[PDB]
Point group: C4
Chain length 424, copies 4
């Protein structure tokens, strides 16, 4: 009834997230289309690039430098002669206007640029001039002292004909293309990178799954209304309680409403400005479904046979939070120590990100023989540091390894005490 | 006696699985022959391929494309001139009939194929035409817009002379060979792959181990009859119980009968249609032997000294199943969250398979510094997602890491309570 | 008040270590400048080198040998013709004086060197002669029997112009450069290595963040004085106690004073002789901040709600130390066994360092499938050793894996006993 | 006194194993000399080989095949022209006599060899003829159908001059050299391998560390006599006990005597037939030192403060052994299942060795994301097997992961019961 409505919401959002996962399978075939094309154009425009080169597809020779510039130049020259896909290029100007290239060799470098490190002097008008060469579909050089970044933009149209095997009418992708020689460091290591976007549109010459999605949206709307009614019942009970864990009979419903509104927003409203907002709204729906599973397990406990494990979660977080505070203090201190130490020798130490990176290497064991090994293998320097690195790292290792089972089993015996009360 | 018959079945299936493992050692030398030949023909027919290329042995140049086509063409040309093995090719037609090639350059591509993405149009008779060129042992081109898949089939005969070192008469392998340029994506990334089968037959000019296997089969038949008699005794006891864990005094015997019938079926009956059915029946025999070990440990407990550990398994699954339900709900929710999130950036996220892939990375530590590292290293995009990815992944990490020791030690103290009852 | 002063010290050193982490972010951008340049010159001077070559960028051909010598020779020849950076080279002699090169082809090899292994004889004046060729910015051979080591030194000046994007005036780096062909083994495997240092100086033509750092230093001085006053109070209490854990109300303050003096020394006094002393003093500040977090957690426990977890650490170390002694005895014995065994086959066994390396492979799981796998894969030798290696390694594996949870959960139940006393 | 003699034995074997570790450091520098030379000759004789090639340095082309043969041929031709070491070759015949080569191109292939797989026939006199070409220091072909294995033997002398930096007189190594093209499979994948030994001898023109080792040996002899006296005391106590854990007051002494006799045997007696017997005797000494640490910890417990942890080991093995029997039954069954399953798709499944390989992947986490990942990535076949592989592997994973903490914490609470008795 009313719990039949709740379980209907459970299966209904379950089917809606099944439709989400269906949307995911379809868009995932599509994004496989994306990635196929992505590595594709990487081959395609790419000159001298390699598999795995994304770590280091970067230049030393200026003759190297212009080499790739021309290489892409010819690629734009001769793509229809050469490829295996079917790219199409109509006018499509950017990113600065005027007019349409479609290959725009863009170059930004500073407007005032006197630079003589031999006299130890420089005079820089840090305003940057960008010269662009428009390249009509059927050579010029830049100062290496002068450079900031060099850009090729170009876009190619195609139709995902593989959607016939998905029984669908094919769609039109337009992959926009920014190849970049980049020297923001200005250090000599000119990284090249190809980035791309794509517009998906329907064919020029041209919905039951979409109707089923719309019906799912309407069902989600009815479910959110049911959540609103249940919350009004809970609020009337709260007004009676004021006048007179399990944690989520309200709150999970509110999260579900957030997910449902997110899905509605993803279907239509922000769906005319979709892509990233669609991704984030999927981000919302996931927690909704996670709550869907969780409260499904709560309600489908049916007391779980007396819910001993349900109550087991209860007492410990009362200790576990302060213990969490303490251990996190330990974690942050270890993090500060990393923020100090790793600069002398580390790739795994690179930023506060990499500091977070060390922390999994705490709890997990993947990086220890990696890192604690190889740093001991000593790229190294300044052998007191080589002592001190062992001094730090072995010290970091043992502490949580002992004490964390201490915390978990301490609250374990805490729940053992919660089973000392609770096993009777 | 009767338990001597059971232990005789234990050692008898133990010897039969020793014979299975013997069959495994022999077939494993053989399948090493398979794999040796497999990498072999991969070298052999393969042109431009590499070690490790199986990740990416795929094409960009159409001139690349025909290059490999010709490369294999010459390989079929000149194998006896060139090789280190001894391949033999007699008529052997396929896969479509008429007649015998033995090198069949097969090409499938659609029968109606107007495709112009520049006008945003296409007219496809999705019926596919396949042209095949038969290549008699002692060049033509395909439309790149037009292609679907391109196939070379060829088969080579040889005799595993290395079986003389196994003291056996050598056998005849016929490796059938499908090299394929594949463009089912039609995206430009034409993967090539060589797949092969082989027929093993006896020599044209031509059994005590086979007799010992047959005797093992007869012994397995006697053991299954003993299991049938013991089950009739148990069923008469059940009829007396109706008229009036340890779990497997029947059920393990029934599994053993399944394994024994599977082995009998693998020896003879489906042995005239063997290979995969033989593999699956080995799949059966393994669980039989696993049960063989397990019930061996049960019976050879001899009460295990009072079987405290035997009874230890008893009480906990009563809690552990519902707890398993709960944690699996947690697992499935995390899985849905993966099914959402990873599409923006992941190889480890690729499908529900890869979703299962994340789960070991939960319990194990191999992938954390891998994945939680490198995704943080941010191929990335849309930096709110870069926040949110950390937001998801660190969140996924801690939860089971805490609570799973909670579950295990909660049932641990549960068995501690089962030892609180049971340690006295 | 006085605890407001302590928390002000907590936030004050917190901000000072925030300034440390700020100094770290700034110097880390700089050291990224270092590493960018480092891989740079590695490309730059490097001839025939590769990515990943640092494992094996070493020679076999003498024609190989001179090849790289000339390769660097031309690099010094033609750097301004070729590069992407802006290197500058003024006189700058070294490492022996007289005068200035700036490219010094240095070669050391023994002064008396009769070596005939065919007669099994050698007469070596182990004094070494070093010939050096000074190479003025705009070929000679060495005996391969005769060689000891061959060295190129050269230094290049540049200005880190990328600091304009950090809104700073750019600085002058001078990268000093030692490329070395090294044959101290004299075995034929001539490793080459490029090592570099750099002097950072201000520009020739030329401080509020520095003033804020100085104010932070003065605040640290006031905090150390507050620590000195609190220690005088504690010492007067100790004099009253003599006349009549929590562990760090003194000791953490003393560590903080050490860190504060270290930071003061890093700011000014040893700051005229900085780099490694600066690194070590950062080494000091880290433990200070770690203590900062820890005692922050102590004081901000506020009894932690009765500090059950604080007292939890108390009783166990009384057992844990002797248990630690015992397990470490186990560890050292395993270490001796490694020191024996691995010489026949191991890279992971290389030294007492690598012995420490095995120990993480104990507690962690990263190397097991690596090492216990691949050594079983048997580079190997002397198959009794192949048995014995399994005999050792599987033996090493299980012992701690069982017993260490034994120790941790034994003190776990010890703290369970400490919660048996302490859960009431 | 007498315990001073025992602790003197502890420190004395400690110093003797320090001398063992010293011998290890010295021989390890030497074996580094070995490995340096090993990769050396691998470069040296090796033609077309690569770094990492040891996985796959194997042939396809017969023109490839002879290519390397000649390549080594010229290497023997022109080593003194080319190298960086100092190799010396005097007569040194082998492995068959008559006379001295020193480069012996040896080829074994069967004496009767009619092989026609096209007629499905073969007539093999499995006696093998070996033709050898002696190559005097300053081309012929083999049937590819006919081949079995092809061998080059050659030996080079040199003096480890790097021992002058160890302050020692240098020694004479003679590296004997077997390069082998091997086709025992006869499948076409002719693996090449270079194996080498070396004789270490003193110089032709020519001991306080050796005297200190001899004194250590005499001290070990006195310690073994003390162990014999203590065992005679224990045996007289046993004779009084018959007439009327801690486990190793005898037994550790007996192990120590075994180690001491092993060291004495390694010093002199079998030291005229040393190398592998020396390795094995080091194998003995290690367990001696391990016992040295262990009983050191026993005696230096001094009751360990009441030896609660010493007694903690006591009760549990009484359960742990039968539990170990049970879990090992589980392990063996999983092992049989592997022995079945992996043949269809695995490198990690290769033999009972690799079966042991899976087991660490059980307890450790290194291989899970590796193997359970990549096998799911499906080289694969026969998709019911693809289901069944997941069916097996996920099943293998969870079982020990749950139950093993069950066993450890079950005996943990067992020792908790042993601390329930033992914490009072």
């Amino acid at each position: 009834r009313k719990p039949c409505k709740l379980m209907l919401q459970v299966v209904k959002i379950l089917v809606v997230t099944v439709q989400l996962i269906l949307f995911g399978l379809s868009n995932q075939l599509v994004v496989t289309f994306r990635e196929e094309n992505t590595i594709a154009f990487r081959h395609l425009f790419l000159l001298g690039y390699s598999d795995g080169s994304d770590d280091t597809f970067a230049a030393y020779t200026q003759e190297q430098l212009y080499q790739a510039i021309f290489y892409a130049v010819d690629q734009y020259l001769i793509l229809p002669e050469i490829s295996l896909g079917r790219y199409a290029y109509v006018r499509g100007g950017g990113g600065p206007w005027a007019n349409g290239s479609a290959l725009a060799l863009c170059q930004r470098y500073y407007h005032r640029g006197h630079v003589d490190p031999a006299n130890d002097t420089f005079d820089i008008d840090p305003r940057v001039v960008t010269d662009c060469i428009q390249v009509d579909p059927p050579n010029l050089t830049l100062k290496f002292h002068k450079l900031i970044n060099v850009t090729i933009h170009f876009q190619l149209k195609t139709i995902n004909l593989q959607s016939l095997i998905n029984n669908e009418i094919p769609d039109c992708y337009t992959f926009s293309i920014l190849i970049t020689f980049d020297n923001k460091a200005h250090s000599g290591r000119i990284p090249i990178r190809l980035e791309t976007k794509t517009h998906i549109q329907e064919c020029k010459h041209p919905s039951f799954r979409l109707l089923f999605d719309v019906v799912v949206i309407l069902t989600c709307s009815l479910s959110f209304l049911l959540c609103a009614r249940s919350l009004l019942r809970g609020f009337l009970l709260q007004n009676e309680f004021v006048v007179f864990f399990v944690n989520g009979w309200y709150i999970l419903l509110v999260t579900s409403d957030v997910l449902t509104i997110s899905g509605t927003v993803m279907k239509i409203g922000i769906e005319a400005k979709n892509l990233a907002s669609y991704d984030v709204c999927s981000i919302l729906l996931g927690t909704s479904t996670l709550l869907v599973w969780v409260g499904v397990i709560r309600y489908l406990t049916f007391f779980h046979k007396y819910n001993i494990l349900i109550a087991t979660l209860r007492v410990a977080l009362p200790s576990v939070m302060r213990f969490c505070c303490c251990v996190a203090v330990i974690y942050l201190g270890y993090c500060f120590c990393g923020w100090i130490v790793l600069g002398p020798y580390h790739v795994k130490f690179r930023s506060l990100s990499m500091v977070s990176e060390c922390l999994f290497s705490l709890i997990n064991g993947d990086d220890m023989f990696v890192t604690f090994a190889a740093m001991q293998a000593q790229q190294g320097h300044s052998s007191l540091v080589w002592l001190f690195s062992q001094l730090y790292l072995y010290s970091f290792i043992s502490l949580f390894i002992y004490m964390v089972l201490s915390l978990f089993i301490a609250l374990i015996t805490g729940a053992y005490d919660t089973i000392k009360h609770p096993g009777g």
